[PDB]
Design a protein around this nucleic acid. Structure first.
Ligand SMILES: [Zn+2]
Ligand SMILES: [Zn+2]
Length: 105
DNA sequence: TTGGTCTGCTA
DNA sequence: AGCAGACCAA
């Protein structure tokens, strides 16, 4: 579980992250989504909107503590979003070239 | 908010 | 495994 330098390969982006296998991909997925125009996470309990899985979960925790029901899992985003193909596409454009992001290597 | 870092378990 | 909840710092 050593530290790896993960680089975003999207056009004109110089973002990089210190990353370990155990971290998982939340921060990386959210960064890829910043390259998706007009993509927004809408709160299912009010008119709040934001970008990013981490942010919408923080909104749920702070603004809706009576809703014990949890937000979406990271492995549900691609397969249930109407723009899921675009989301998986922007992930590949951003991070696919980082070989260590592959499972089992 | 976001980054850097951390880790128990539906281990 | 790595999700996803956690901390503090900026
Ligand atoms: Zn980027
Ligand atoms: Zn809300």
């Amino acid at each position: 579980n050593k530290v790896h330098i993960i680089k975003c390969h999207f056009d004109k982006c110089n973002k990089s992250y210190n990353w370990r296998k155990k971290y998982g991909k939340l921060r990386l997925v959210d960064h890829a989504f910043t390259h998706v125009p007009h993509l927004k996470m809408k709160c299912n309990f009010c008119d709040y909107m934001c970008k990013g899985i981490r942010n919408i979960r923080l909104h749920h925790k702070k603004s809706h503590p009576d809703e014990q029901l949890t937000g979406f899992g990271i492995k549900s985003v691609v397969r249930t979003s109407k723009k899921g193909k675009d989301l998986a596409k922007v992930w590949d454009e951003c991070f696919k070239k980082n070989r260590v992001l592959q499972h089992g290597s």
